[PDB]
Symmetry: D3
Subunit: 151 residues, 6 copies
């Protein structure tokens, strides 16, 4: 049921504070399927383009510097409403406003170090996925539990 | 304290995806007392009797058929306001509306495969408990942590 | 694969200390298939027969009296070499000799309060299974992960 | 970053039910820094002063008597907005109103046995910290993750 | 202390049974640093070369077919004795012989489906890493906890 | 039962890497009773007194210096054979020799940064308990699970 996808990245602090496994586990246990996984050092050009809608924000320059200061984990997840639900799972932009149970709510404190980010919408998702992944990187397969996750 | 009881069932998908232990731990750690526990394949009759209020629903048959497609874990839990809080712990009928931290919110995606279900009123609870369990299958015992869970 | 089965029981102390979910989780994560599951208070007759081989031990009377003092969770698990491996998973008879990582090693201390028990041979398992369960109580189904657990 | 501090105490029932490690783990994983930690049996005088603001509640006598019936784990945690967020992490006063994902929501049921407590304002936190700890008991150090938690 | 590396791959069953997060978490919590992470569909040529030392084994053809039947997660970890210790963490080749606590011991049953594999030695490790990763894929950075993991 | 006690300390690296909760949970879930708990920075004198038997060791100074470099969590735990089993739970002096499932085995790598330590004999235990704790810092209480942990 629905092969909608979404882009999710584990920021540098998430990697530094050893939360990669915990984060990946949350999507797996949820029932979403992993299609892309990459550990890299995103270039500013890549970052600037990814965060184009915020190019004019006072903190923009800081966001790019930070996201570029260390390696990240780029990921792509598939599932019904994965974009909207993914957002719920990460929690509000500001950790202070993220509810316990969400990724940001349980593991971080400051907005400038909120360990993870994702896609805001479907359109944005496809656009972002293409920006980070080459079509030959999105592995396709069927989950042995697909029939128990979807009717 | 309180002797209120509720009926909770781990659905076929819940069993198939290996969430039995996880779900039971949720109730144990909360302080609720396990009263009845049985692994079974619910007969089509039992299920129709159980979901009666949904008989004339545009998907009743698909529901009854699915719940009959595999074994389930039928449970009875005891504790102050267990019925109401049990519902909270489960989350919303639609996993997309269930908050992270809840069972449906953390472990599933679609309403048709929402891994678990439970009584939504003290009246329905007793009714359902009478339908799925024989009185001798409800065990009476006192938790050693009794005085630390209740005033 | 393999349809070998084993009988495993979570003792009264295992239930009292809230370890039911944790224990079930370990057999589920291993790949074993849950076949039977019941919450009950074993009668002294049932217990004396189950432990007949120990009928002449100094501690036999104590074991029976104790195993009858509270409810136990009786289970039947299926899988390749489930009997021998289930034993490895439980740990040694004396928790003091059990290795960290095992059920007894991680969760208990004294031999007389060792939270769990299980068959030690295929022959005994089938005898015990027939002793604690009615044929209709053992459910047959196929794990959606079957092909990924067994070649 | 921020050096705001908060006082949090694991109540007698929290200790009795083996939740000390679990609770500490939640503040550590969030990014907060442990500043003070002591296991003690609070005297009635200390408790009456700590809860002075509730001195006129019908349940005040009961609270004091109860909070004095067993040992508690007193703690001081540091971090940006630790006071307000610590409160969010604990859940609501009445466990029934606490959301899954919160400490009270996940681990307890009744208001009189709600396993944990903490400051509700910066002013109160500093008063309580000074009340329960000696200055030399509050340790100053720098988290190796400092730069990845705070910008 | 020591930048020795090692190659570790999460076989297709490990991916299918949602153990990616759990596995990654075990290396992070251990203290090892992640340098490479890739989700792919290893070609037979790649596989045949990787398993050259077993080219003549009766089950070789089966191993290649299986490892190629689905996507895997290639990884590279750094740390003192990571190759030898990694081996310990995965557990024996045959799950039946893997101790509880190890990855294979806790999560799988059959040798033909032992969810994970790694490098047998340092030399082999470098060789294998080169075979799977392009020098421009092994991200290098320093852990904020490096001084607490090594003297 | 048994009133034997042992001294366990979470080292500076243990605190720095956020393993306090994890470690305490290990002892709580096993059934041991928490007797003393204090967060402190051990003075150089105390440490020399504690590691006396290692004074004339080629790395005594580096040890004493390190243990003084940051706060530690000093603990006293009670239970049948706690000293001996506590050592088992910790693992081997060298993490590379510690089996998965143990604390050192699961969470650290080098002997110089082995996150935890504890008494290795009943004699040393009492000696060390007298060195780190004031008699009033050892709390006496009875676990509600007392009868389910010990015969
Ligand atoms: N007010 C802010 N101050 C600093 N950084 C911010 C602020 N708002 C957003 N950011 C940063 O920009 C990232 C992208 O913003 P946005 O996409 O709007 O939120 P989200 O990542 O939660 O979807 C955030 O994850 C955060 O790191
Ligand atoms: N719109 C729907 N589409 C498919 N299945 C549904 C739908 N609504 C409800 N169901 C199924 O019927 C079950 C019973 O519904 P109901 O009792 O009303 O909600 P709940 O089980 O959450 O209390 C649900 O758990 C779900 O499996
Ligand atoms: N020395 C003993 N003292 C008390 N109880 C014992 C003793 N030895 C064995 N028992 C009890 O008898 C049970 C059955 O023994 P056995 O089946 O031989 O070991 P296991 O339970 O590990 O399969 C044990 O689980 C334990 O509860
Ligand atoms: N109605 C009540 N009955 C019994 N105890 C209560 C009641 N209301 C509050 N308490 C107790 O008083 C404590 C202190 O109250 P308060 O500080 O206002 O809430 P909180 O503990 O959530 O900060 C609560 O944690 C609870 O143990
Ligand atoms: N006897 C066997 N039968 C089937 N498959 C085997 C056998 N021995 C090894 N294999 C497979 O080949 C893989 C590589 O073997 P090897 O590298 O020797 O062991 P390990 O992966 O544990 O290092 C194993 O992980 C397993 O999948
Ligand atoms: N060879 C070594 N090199 C460095 N530090 C060591 C060495 N041997 C021991 N240590 C340190 O000294 C501590 C005390 O040693 P010891 O008490 O003999 O072992 P254990 O603490 O495991 O009981 C160890 O925990 C470790 O931190
Ligand atoms: Ca975004
Ligand atoms: Ca319902
Ligand atoms: Ca009836
Ligand atoms: Ca036995
Ligand atoms: Ca029979
Ligand atoms: Ca308060
Ligand atoms: Ca003071
Ligand atoms: Ca190998
Ligand atoms: Ca020692
Ligand atoms: Ca003294």
């Amino acid at each position: 049921a629905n092969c909608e996808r979404t882009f999710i990245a584990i920021k540098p602090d998430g990697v530094q504070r050893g939360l990669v496994g915990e984060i990946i586990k949350r999507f797996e246990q949820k029932g979403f399927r992993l299609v892309g996984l990459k550990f890299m050092q995103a270039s500013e050009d890549l970052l600037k383009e990814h965060y184009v809608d915020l190019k004019d924000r006072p903190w923009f320059a800081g966001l790019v510097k930070y996201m570029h200061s260390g390696p990240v984990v780029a990921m792509v997840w598939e599932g019904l409403n994965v974009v909207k639900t993914g957002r719920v799972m990460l929690g509000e932009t500001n950790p202070a406003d993220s509810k316990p149970g969400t990724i940001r709510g349980d593991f971080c404190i400051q907005v400038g170090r909120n360990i993870i980010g994702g896609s805001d919408s479907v359109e944005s998702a496809e656009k972002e996925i293409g920006l980070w992944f080459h079509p030959e990187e999105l592995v396709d397969y069927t989950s042995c539990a697909q029939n128990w996750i979807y009717e």
